[PDB]
Design an enzyme around this catalytic site. Structure first.
Site, PDB file in Angstrom:
ATOM      1  NE  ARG A 173      -2.401  -3.063   2.834  1.00 41.03           N
ATOM      2  CZ  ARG A 173      -2.670  -3.689   3.982  1.00 41.03           C
ATOM      3  NH1 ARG A 173      -2.685  -3.011   5.132  1.00 41.03           N
ATOM      4  NH2 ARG A 173      -2.926  -5.000   3.976  1.00 41.03           N
ATOM      5  NE  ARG A 197      -9.411   0.775  -2.636  1.00 40.83           N
ATOM      6  CZ  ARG A 197      -8.845  -0.397  -2.297  1.00 40.83           C
ATOM      7  NH1 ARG A 197      -7.719  -0.445  -1.582  1.00 40.83           N
ATOM      8  NH2 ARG A 197      -9.410  -1.545  -2.680  1.00 40.83           N
ATOM      9  CB  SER A 245     -12.453  -8.639  -3.234  1.00 43.91           C
ATOM     10  OG  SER A 245     -11.526  -9.633  -2.834  1.00 43.91           O
ATOM     11  NE  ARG A 246     -11.337  -7.015   2.385  1.00 47.15           N
ATOM     12  CZ  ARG A 246     -10.332  -7.773   2.856  1.00 47.15           C
ATOM     13  NH1 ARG A 246     -10.544  -9.032   3.255  1.00 47.15           N
ATOM     14  NH2 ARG A 246      -9.098  -7.276   2.916  1.00 47.15           N
ATOM     15  CD  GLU A 281      -5.798  -2.237  -8.850  1.00 48.35           C
ATOM     16  OE1 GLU A 281      -6.632  -3.173  -8.851  1.00 48.35           O
ATOM     17  OE2 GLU A 281      -4.633  -2.352  -8.374  1.00 48.35           O
ATOM     18  CD  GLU A 328      -3.132  -6.248 -11.162  1.00 52.54           C
ATOM     19  OE1 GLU A 328      -3.660  -6.173 -10.029  1.00 52.54           O
ATOM     20  OE2 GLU A 328      -1.945  -5.906 -11.387  1.00 52.54           O
ATOM     21  CE  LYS A 341      -6.809   9.981   7.117  1.00 56.00           C
ATOM     22  NZ  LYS A 341      -6.465  10.802   8.342  1.00 56.00           N
ATOM     23  CG  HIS A 342     -10.103   3.763   1.112  1.00 59.67           C
ATOM     24  ND1 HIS A 342      -8.946   3.218   1.623  1.00 59.67           N
ATOM     25  CD2 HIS A 342     -11.022   2.769   1.110  1.00 59.67           C
ATOM     26  CE1 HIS A 342      -9.166   1.951   1.937  1.00 59.67           C
ATOM     27  NE2 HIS A 342     -10.417   1.654   1.635  1.00 59.67           N
ATOM     28  NE  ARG A 385     -12.188  -8.598  -8.633  1.00 56.70           N
ATOM     29  CZ  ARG A 385     -11.879  -8.156  -7.413  1.00 56.70           C
ATOM     30  NH1 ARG A 385     -12.828  -7.785  -6.554  1.00 56.70           N
ATOM     31  NH2 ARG A 385     -10.604  -8.086  -7.047  1.00 56.70           N
TER      32      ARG A 385
END
Length: 138
Positions: free
Chosen positions: A2, A12, A32-33, A58, A61, A82-83, A107
Site C-alpha cells: 500500500r 487508490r 472481493s469482500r 487495476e 487485473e 480512510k481512502h 471475480r
C-alpha cells in the site's frame, strides 16, 4: 504493498469502464469482500504509480479490459475506510476472456446502464455511485 497520501489517506485508483464514448453502459465486477455484489473496479496505488498508472493496471487485473484512459473524473474520499480514489473514465477497447482476478479469486464482470449501475451500487458501496453521479453533476 500500500501507499499513503500526504494526509494519511491510502491512495487508490479506479476507473469507470464505458463501452462507448457515449458513456451509457459501465462495466461492474463482483466484490472481493462480499461475492454477492457488484463494484467499480479499482484498487490501491502501488509503491510509486501515477494515479493514471494504477487506474489502468487495476481494471486490467480486476475487470480484465484495456482501453483509452480518459479524464480524471475526480478524487473521491471515504471516511469509514480512510481512502482516496483517483477515478478515470476508460473506453474499453479490448475485452479479455481471461484476466488474472477472474482465474484466481473468482471475480465476475458485466455491463450496466449508468442509472442502473448507480442503483446496484448505492446499496453497499455508495462512494462508487458518487462516481457515476459525478457525470451528471457537471
Amino acid at each position: 504493498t500500500r501507499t499513503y497520501d500526504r494526509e494519511g489517506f491510502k491512495k487508490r485508483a479506479a476507473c469507470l469502464c464505458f463501452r462507448s464514448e457515449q458513456e451509457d453502459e459501465v462495466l461492474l465486477v463482483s466484490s472481493s469482500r462480499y461475492p454477492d455484489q457488484w463494484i467499480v473496479p479499482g484498487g490501491g496505488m502501488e509503491p510509486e504509480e501515477e494515479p493514471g498508472g494504477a487506474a489502468v493496471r487495476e481494471v486490467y487485473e480486476e475487470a480484465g479490459v484495456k482501453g483509452k484512459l480518459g479524464r480524471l473524473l475526480g478524487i473521491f474520499e471515504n471516511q469509514d475506510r480512510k481512502h482516496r480514489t483517483y477515478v478515470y473514465v476508460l473506453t474499453v477497447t479490448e475485452i479479455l476472456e481471461d484476466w488474472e482476478d477472474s482465474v484466481n479469486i473468482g471475480r465476475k464482470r458485466e455491463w450496466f446502464k449508468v442509472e442502473d449501475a448507480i442503483k446496484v451500487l448505492q446499496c453497499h458501496k455508495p462512494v462508487h455511485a458518487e462516481y457515476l453521479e459525478k457525470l451528471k453533476l457537471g
